[PDB]
Amino acid sequence: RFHSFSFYELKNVTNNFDERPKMGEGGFGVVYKGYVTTVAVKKLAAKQQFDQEIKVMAKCQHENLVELLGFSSDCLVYVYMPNGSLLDRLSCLDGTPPLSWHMRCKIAQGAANGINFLHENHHIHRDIKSANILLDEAFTAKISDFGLARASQTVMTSRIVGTTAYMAPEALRGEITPKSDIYSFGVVLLEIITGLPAVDEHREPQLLLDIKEEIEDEEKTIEDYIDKKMNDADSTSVEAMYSVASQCLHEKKNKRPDIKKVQQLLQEMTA
Ligand SMILES: CC(C)Oc1ccccc1C(N)=O
The missing domain is CATH 1.10.510.10 (Transferase(Phosphotransferase) domain 1)
Incomplete structure (x- = not known):
C-alpha cells in the first residue's frame, strides 16, 4: 500500500525538522527535505486532512500527480x-x-x-x-x-x-x-x-x-x-x-x- 516510517527516522533524515533555507510552507504544515533516495516530509502543525490525503493518494496514482511514499504517527512522505x-x-x-x-x-x-x-x-x-x-x-x-x-x-x-x-x-x-x-x-x-x-x-x-x-x-x-x-x-x-x-x-x-x-x-x- 504505502510505507509506514518511524517518526525518529524522519526526525533524523530531516536534521530534527530544521527550518533553515525546509523546502515549503504548506497550509497545515512545513515541508522538509529528507534522505532515505531524496524525499519530502510534510510534518503537520497547528488531523482530518491527514486521513483524506492518504485515502486520495491510495486511489490516485498518475504520471501528473505527486506520489505519496508513506506516512508516520509516533507526517506525510512524498517523492522529492x-x-x-x-x-x-x-x-x-x-x-x-x-x-x-x-x-x-x-x-x-x-x-x-x-x-x-x-x-x-x-x-x-x-x-x-x-x-x-x-x-x-x-x-x-x-x-x-x-x-x-x-x-x-x-x-x-x-x-x-x-x-x-x-x-x-x-x-x-x-x-x-x-x-x-x-x-x-x-x-x-x-x-x-x-x-x-x-x-x-x-x-x-x-x-x-x-x-x-x-x-x-x-x-x-x-x-x-x-x-x-x-x-x-x-x-x-x-x-x-x-x-x-x-x-x-x-x-x-x-x-x-x-x-x-x-x-x-x-x-x-x-x-
Ligand atoms: C506534495 C508536497 C508536500 O511536496 C512538496 C511541497 C513543497 C515543495 C516540494 C515538495 C516536494 N515533493 O519536493
Whole structure:
C-alpha cells in the first residue's frame, strides 16, 4: 500500500525538522527535505486532512500527480520534486532561470492530465493554483495537496476553502463542483502566459483574472501581457492557450468546458 516510517527516522533524515533555507510552507504544515533516495516530509502543525490525503493518494496514482511514499504517527512522505512549484519557477525565486514557452506548454498539458485523472476518478481538488503544481527533474507537472479534496454532483458547504485569487464565483459561495477546478486552472494558464502571480497587492489590477476583461474590452491584447522573460513564444500558440484560459474563466459554471475539452485544446495547441 504505502510505507509506514518511524517518526525518529524522519526526525533524523530531516536534521530534527530544521527550518533553515525546509523546502515549503504548506497550509497545515512545513515541508522538509529528507534522505532515505531524496524525499519530502510534510510534518503537520497547528488531523482530518491527514486521513483524506492518504485515502486520495491510495486511489490516485498518475504520471501528473505527486506520489505519496508513506506516512508516520509516533507526517506525510512524498517523492522529492527538485524543481519546486510552478509559482516559484514563474517568479524565478532564488535566481532560477525563466521557464521557456516550450517548457510552459508541456507543464500546462501535464497539469490538465493530472486534473483529468482526478475528475475521471470523481475527485474535486478544491485548491488548483501554481503553488500546488510541483515540478520534477524533467519539469513534469505534478498536482499536489489533496487534504481538502472531495469525492464527487452539486453540493454546498459551511466551511468555504481555497485561495481567493484562484477561486470560482460559486466556490466562494460554498458550492463543491469540479467546474470550480476548471476556473482555477484558467487562472494558472494566465500565470503561465504572463509570468504574473494571481494576486499582487502592489499591482494595478491586483487580481490577474481582471486582465481578461481588459483584453475583452478591446483596450489591450494578450500580446501586451505575454511574459517578456521568454524568447521562444509565438502568437499562434500563446493565443491558443489564452483562448483555453478564457473559456475556463467563464463566470457561469455551466458555460465552462469540461477537463477533457481543456486537455484536447491544449494538445491541439502543439499539433
Ligand atoms: C506534495 C508536497 C508536500 O511536496 C512538496 C511541497 C513543497 C515543495 C516540494 C515538495 C516536494 N515533493 O519536493
